Design a protein around this nucleic acid. Structure first.
Ligand SMILES: [Zn+2]
Lengths: 363, 63, 140
RNA sequence: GUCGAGGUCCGGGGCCCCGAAAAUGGACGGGGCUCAAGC
RNA sequence: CCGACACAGGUGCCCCUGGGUGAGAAGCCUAAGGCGUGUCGGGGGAAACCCGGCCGAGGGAACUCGGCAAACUGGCCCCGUAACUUCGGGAGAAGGGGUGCCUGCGGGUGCGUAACCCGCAGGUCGCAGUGACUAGGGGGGCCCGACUGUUUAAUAAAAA
RNA sequence: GCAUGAAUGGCGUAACGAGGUCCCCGCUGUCCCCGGCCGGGGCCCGGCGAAACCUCUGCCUGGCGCGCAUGCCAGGGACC
RNA sequence: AGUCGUCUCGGGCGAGAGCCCAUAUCGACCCCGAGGCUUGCUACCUCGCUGUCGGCUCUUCCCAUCCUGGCCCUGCAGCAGGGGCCAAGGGUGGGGGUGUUCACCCAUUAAAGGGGAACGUGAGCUGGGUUUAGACCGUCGUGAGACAGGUCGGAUGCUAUCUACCGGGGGUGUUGGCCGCCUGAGGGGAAGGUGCCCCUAGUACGAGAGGAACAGGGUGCCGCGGCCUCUGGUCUACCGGUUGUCCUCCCGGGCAUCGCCGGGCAGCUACGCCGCAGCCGAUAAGGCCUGAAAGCAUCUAAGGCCGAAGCGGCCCCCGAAAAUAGGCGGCCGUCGAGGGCUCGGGUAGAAGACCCGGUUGAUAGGGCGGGGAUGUAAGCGGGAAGGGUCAACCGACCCGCUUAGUCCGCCGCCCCUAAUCGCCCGAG
C-alpha cells in the first residue's frame, strides 16, 4: 500500500477549550542571575521593519524585511510573596503573604459633571479578581507575617519562593479587572530570592528592568478561537472524491471491523483554536518607552501606526517589539519567559540595526 | 530602505511593499498595488484620473 | 578550495516560490534548438502522497521537447527555470514578477547547451548557476 | 626437562542451554515464586 | 375531477393573449386581471456538515475505467472555406474582421419629411458595445447500423 | 484464420447517430490544494405531532465454545 | 475454522566450484523444522439472507529491515560490492498502457520492503471488472439452447435504540460554605525525520584512473503548531461604469444570478510569513579490562569499562474523581460571605459555557476628529462633431467649482442617550 504521515499530531490532545484564559507556565529556565523570569503584556498588533541581520546564517550583514509584533506592557505590580516546601510527591505551598492596602495613584481618574474624583485605591481593583480580601489588615500584621515567613526560610522548610504580581489594564485604559500571576525568580539561594521579592513588594516592575533586548524568549498565550471545525480544517484530511454523493469534507472510514470500536486517533470534528500554546525561541527586537521608539539617539517615533492599531487603541505605555507572530487574538494577555531550550549559536544580546520602521496605516 | 515610485500613480510607496514587473525587453515597472497594476495592464488612461501625478501633467498640457 | 573557478553552481539567499508543477509548458529562451518543453520531474525534491513536484526560479527540472528542430524533439533534457509569472519575495520584502515561464536547457551538471539567452535572466537563477549568469546578456 | 598431585579418553544417565520470527495490549487462571511457591 | 390526501403526478394547453427590447407565441421588465393559500411562524457572524449558486493566484487532465461535472464558443453583417462524395452534400467545415451612443446625409417601396427596411461620413465614451437577457465550441482516425422512425410503462434506447 | 467468407450474404461506402472507440488545438477547481462568499436546511425558542424498529440488557485484552462473545473464565478499567 | 501436500523462510552434513583453501561467496545428493503472508484438501459455524474484485478516504499492528542509526566477516586498497548481527522512532513518493491486485516501462529519489486487521474499511464513497433480465460475433448442438470465449448496455434504500470515539454542559462526593493562586500521581507526542552544498581535500588510499572520513558552517524537502505586517483569493459591507425594461423626462430608485463588469478596507484564508534541544542515564548488536575452572591460554563463569535514529529524562499538550478524592492565603457560619436570572457588548460561541463593562462608567448608540475604500457627485458656467432662418434652440461627450461626493462590520475625545428597576439560590 501507499504510505504517508498521519493527518495532524497526537501530541496536542485533547483539543479542548483552554482551562483558563490566563495562560499557565509549567516549567521555568535555570538562570544564575537574580531576576524575575518573565513578564506579561497585551497583544496590540503587527507591523514590519527593515534591519541589518546579525543572526548567523546566509543573510548576515544584509538588510532584510522582518515582521514584528507589538505587546503593550504597562508596569506590573508586585503584591505577594509565596513560599514552597518539599512535599511527599512534589512542591507544596507553605505560606503566602500579600501587602496591605495602599493608595493607587496611577489610576486615570476623570472629573465628570458632579461628584469629586473617585479617589481609587488598591484592594478595590483587585476585588474584581479575588472578591475576598483581608480586612483590618495593618502594617504590623504584614510585618509579623513576613517575619514568620523569613523564620521559616531560616529553619529551612522552604525550598522555593515566588512572586505574586498583578496586571494594571487601567493605566493604559484597556479595562479594570486585573490578572494575577505567579512568577518564579531566577537564582539559587532562597534567601537571595526572598530579599529580591521583599524589596519590591508593593512596588512596580518595568519590562525594561526585567528583560534584555535581543534575547530569546518563549511566548505563552491562548490562541484565537475558531469554534467547531470539521476534520478537513481541524486535522488536514484530504477531500473525498468529487463524485461522492454523501459529502466531501468528511473522513471516509472511521475504522476497520476489528477492533470493534472507534479508535481515539481517527480525525473528528470538535473545538479548534482557543488552546494553550507555547512558542519557543522568539527574539526580542526592542523595548520602547511610553509608546515611543528611539532609533539613533536623536530620532524617536511613535510606534502606533496612523489611525491606530486595528481593533485596538493607541500604545501609550512601555511595549515590546518581538520578531515574528505570536498566538492570541487582539488584546489577549501574553506571557513571556526567557528561552527555555535556546539554540547553541544564539544571536547577540543587543538591539539590531533598524533602518526603517513601518508606521503607515495598517487598516 | 528606499521608497520606490509607482509607475501608474507616480507616488512613492514604503519599503517592503509593492512589486516589480519585468518586461521581456528589460523594462522594469514598479506597482504600489494590485489596483495600479491591473489598471495599467487593462489600459485605463492615468491622465484622466485626478488621484495620479500624470493628471497634473495632462492639465499642464491642456493649459 | 576545490574547483575555485571551475565551479558550476552557487548559493542564493532567496528561495523563489515553486509555482510550476509537473506538466507545465516552459518556453526555451536560448539557442539550443528547442522552443517549448514540458516539465516531467524536479531534481533534488521529495514529494508526498498525491503531490506533484513543483519548481520555481533557479531550480533544475527534467523535461521533454515538444516543439523544436528534429534533432532535439522527443528528447529528455534538463532545464533551469529563469523566469516565472508567479511573483516571489526578495530580501527587502518586495515582490518580483516576470512576463512568461521561461527556462534554459543545460547539462545535468549545469553547463548550458546553448550560447545565448534571449530576454532577462532572474538574479536568483544567475546567482545559483554561475555559467548561466556569465553567458546571460541582461540580468534583472 | 625442570617443577610435583592426579591426569587423558571413550560410551552412557538427570536437569538445563542454543537451534526458537507475527500481526489490538496480556496471559503458568492471576499475583507472584530461586536450599522454591520449580523438578 | 382520478390517483386512500387541501398528492410538485395525470386529466385540460381544451379554446384566447396589451406595451418595450427583440425574427419571434423565446428570455427579461411591465399594463389589465389575479394573488400574498405552490400556507407553520420567530431568533442568529448561532458553528461543523449537507444540498442549490458565484468567484478563485501559478500550472492546465498530472484526476479518473473513461475530460463524469464544469469551462471555452455563442446573435447578426462581411470576407473565406478542406479530405471525401451517391454531385444533392460535407457547410454555419475550418479560419479572420466588425458590432454602443450622438450629429447629419444618401437609397428602396411609397402622394407623403406617414410606415418598414438598406448604406455612407464625422465626433465621442469604457476593461468590456449580440455590455443584461437570448445565444453552436472545434478538428482528425476506426467498428457497427444506410437514412427519418420503433422498443423491454418501473435498472438495458442499443450494433436490437 | 484454436474457431472468416459470399442473400443466417462478402467487401466498400457519401450523408446521418443523446450508439461503442482513439488522438490533437482550446477550455477549465477533475487534479496539485484547497480557500472565501450567497440563499435553503442543520442549531435554539413557540405550536401540530408520528413511523421503521424493539427477547432482556448493553466497557475491554487473551482464551473456552456450534471454531469471529457487551453477558462465560482470568485479568484491566470505569462517579452519575 | 483444522492441516501444511504446495507456498514463503530458516537449519544439520559437506561432494564439489573457488590459482592451494569446504565454509569470502555458491553449495549438489540427502535429512530436520518455522509461519499461516499462494494454492489445495476437509466440510466444523453461517443459505426464515453476514452485499463481491479493484480504486479513493482513514486508523492501527508484526519483522523474515528497502532507506535512515550502530556493528562483524570478506577473494574488504579508496570509491563501491557480497554475506551476516542489533534495531520497527520516521519514510518508503509521481506517472503510461490495462477494471485490474500483480507484473512491465519512464523520470526523479537515501529508499521508492513484504504483510496482518472478516483477502481492514460499500448503515464512508465509486461502480471500471465479476454474476440476472436486452443484443452481436466465433464454436458446439437437428432443436429449444450452451460456452471458468470475446463484445455494447444495465438500480447501490437509513429519522442512531445501546455502546464506541470527538468536542461541549448540569450534578453528587471528596466530613461546613465560598473567591483566588498553585502542586503534578498519571495519560498523549515524531515534534521532529531526512537530503544536498562549502571546507577537511583533489588530502588519506591507490601504479594510474579514481577517490574518502572525524570535526566545523549553510540550506532545501516532508511533518507539526501558530499569525495576517507583506503578496494572492474571496469580501451578495461599500464605491464606480453600463445593457433591457418600469416609476412621465432631469436627479434618485425596483427587477433582470449581486442584472453584467472593474476596484475593494475589516474578517477568513495560503499560493504568504514566523517557531520546532542535542545533552545527560542505563542498555541491544558489537569492542575491551581483570580472572579461574583447565598451574598456561581465555571478554565470562564471579566482577568492571565503553557502546545504537532504539529505551527513561530534560521539552510541549490534558491533568484534584489522583478513593491516600491534594496544598496555601483570605472571607463567611456555628441574619448571612459568595453566586444566578435580568442589562450594554465579543478577546467567545450550535444550546450551555467563556470574556469585558455595568454610574465605583467610555460597554454600545450619538456628535466631532483621525485613518481608510472607490474615484471627482448633484447643480451651474463654458466648449463640443454638426443641424437649424447656418438665428433662437438641440447635441453624445469634455473642461472648472472638485482629492470631490458616497460609505466605512476600524481608531481617539465628549456621559448627550441606554447599561435601570426587580426577582431567586445559598453553608449554618
Ligand atoms: Zn500606484
Amino acid at each position: 500500500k501507499v504510505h504517508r504521515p498521519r493527518r495532524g499530531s497526537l501530541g496536542f490532545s485533547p483539543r479542548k477549550r483552554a482551562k483558563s484564559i490566563v495562560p499557565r507556565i509549567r516549567s521555568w529556565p535555570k538562570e544564575t542571575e537574580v531576576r524575575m523570569l518573565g513578564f506579561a503584556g497585551y497583544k496590540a498588533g503587527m507591523t514590519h521593519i527593515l534591519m541589518i541581520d546579525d543572526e548567523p546564517g546566509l543573510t548576515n550583514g544584509k538588510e532584510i524585511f522582518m515582521p514584528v509584533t507589538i505587546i503593550e506592557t504597562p508596569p506590573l505590580r508586585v503584591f505577594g510573596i509565596r513560599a514552597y516546601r518539599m512535599g511527599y510527591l512534589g512542591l507544596e505551598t507553605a505560606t503566602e503573604v500579600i501587602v496591605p492596602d495602599f493608595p493607587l495613584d496611577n489610576y486615570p481618574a476623570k472629573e465628570r459633571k458632579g461628584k469629586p474624583k473617585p479617589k481609587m485605591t488598591f484592594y478595590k481593583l483587585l476585588e474584581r479578581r479575588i472578591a475576598t480580601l483581608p480586612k483590618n489588615y495593618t502594617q504590623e500584621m504584614f510585618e509579623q507575617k513576613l517575619g514568620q515567613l523569613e523564620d521559616m526560610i531560616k529553619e529551612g522548610e522552604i525550598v522555593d519562593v515566588r512572586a505574586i504580581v498583578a496586571t494594571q489594564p487601567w493605566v493604559i485604559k484597556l479595562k479594570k479587572k486585573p490578572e494575577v500571576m505567579e512568577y518564579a525568580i531566577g537564582g539559587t539561594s532562597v534567601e537571595e530570592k526572598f530579599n529580591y521579592i521583599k524589596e519590591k513588594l508593593g512596588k512596580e516592575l518595568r519590562v525594561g528592568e526585567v528583560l534584555k533586548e535581543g534575547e530569546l524568549l518563549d511566548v505563552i498565550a491562548v490562541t484565537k478561537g475558531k469554534g467547531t471545525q470539521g476534520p478537513v480544517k481541524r486535522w488536514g484530511i484530504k477531500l473525498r472524491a468529487h463524485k461522492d454523493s454523501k459529502g466531501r469534507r468528511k473522513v471516509g472510514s472511521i475504522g476497520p471491523w476489528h477492533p470493534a470500536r472507534v479508535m481515539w486517533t481517527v480525525p473528528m470534528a470538535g473545538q479548534m483554536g482557543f488552546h494553550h500554546r507555547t512558542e519557543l525561541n522568539k527574539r526580542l527586537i526592542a523595548i520602547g518607552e511610553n509608546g515611543k521608539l528611539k532609533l539613533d539617539e536623536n530620532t524617536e517615533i511613535e510606534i502606533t501606526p496612523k489611525g491606530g492599531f486595528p481593533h485596538y487603541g493607541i500604545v501609550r505605555s512601555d511595549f515590546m517589539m518581538i520578531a515574528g507572530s505570536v498566538p492570541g487574538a487582539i488584546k489577549r494577555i501574553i506571557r513571556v519567559r526567557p528561552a527555555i531550550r535556546p539554540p547553541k549559536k544564539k544571536p547577540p544580546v543587543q538591539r539590531p540595526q533598524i533602518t526603517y520602521v513601518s508606521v503607515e496605516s495598517k487598516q | 530602505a528606499r521608497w520606490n515610485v509607482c509607475s501608474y500613480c507616480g507616488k512613492p510607496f514604503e519599503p517592503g511593499t509593492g512589486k516589480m514587473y519585468v518586461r521581456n525587453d528589460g523594462r522594469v515597472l514598479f506597482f504600489c498595488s494590485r489596483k495600479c497594476e491591473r489598471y495599467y495592464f487593462m489600459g485605463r488612461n492615468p491622465r484622466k484620473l485626478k488621484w495620479t501625478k500624470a493628471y497634473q501633467e495632462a492639465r499642464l498640457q491642456r493649459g | 578550495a576545490k574547483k575555485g573557478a571551475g565551479a558550476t553552481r552557487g548559493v542564493s539567499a532567496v528561495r523563489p516560490t515553486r509555482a510550476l508543477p509537473v506538466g507545465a509548458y516552459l518556453t526555451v529562451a536560448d539557442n539550443s534548438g528547442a522552443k517549448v518543453i514540458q516539465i516531467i520531474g524536479v531534481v533534488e525534491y521529495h514529494g508526498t502522497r498525491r503531490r506533484l513536484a513543483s519548481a520555481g526560479v533557479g531550480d533544475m527540472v527534467v523535461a521533454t521537447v515538444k516543439k523544436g528542430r528534429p534533432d532535439m524533439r522527443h528528447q529528455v533534457v534538463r532545464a533551469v527555470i529563469i523566469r516565472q509569472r508567479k511573483e516571489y519575495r526578495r530580501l527587502d520584502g518586495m515582490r518580483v514578477k516576470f512576463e512568461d515561464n521561461a527556462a534554459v536547457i543545460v547539462t545535468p551538471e549545469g553547463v548550458p547547451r546553448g550560447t545565448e539567452i534571449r530576454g532577462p535572466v532572474a538574479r536568483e537563477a544567475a546567482e545559483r548557476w554561475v555559467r548561466i549568469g556569465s553567458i546571460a546578456s541582461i540580468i534583472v
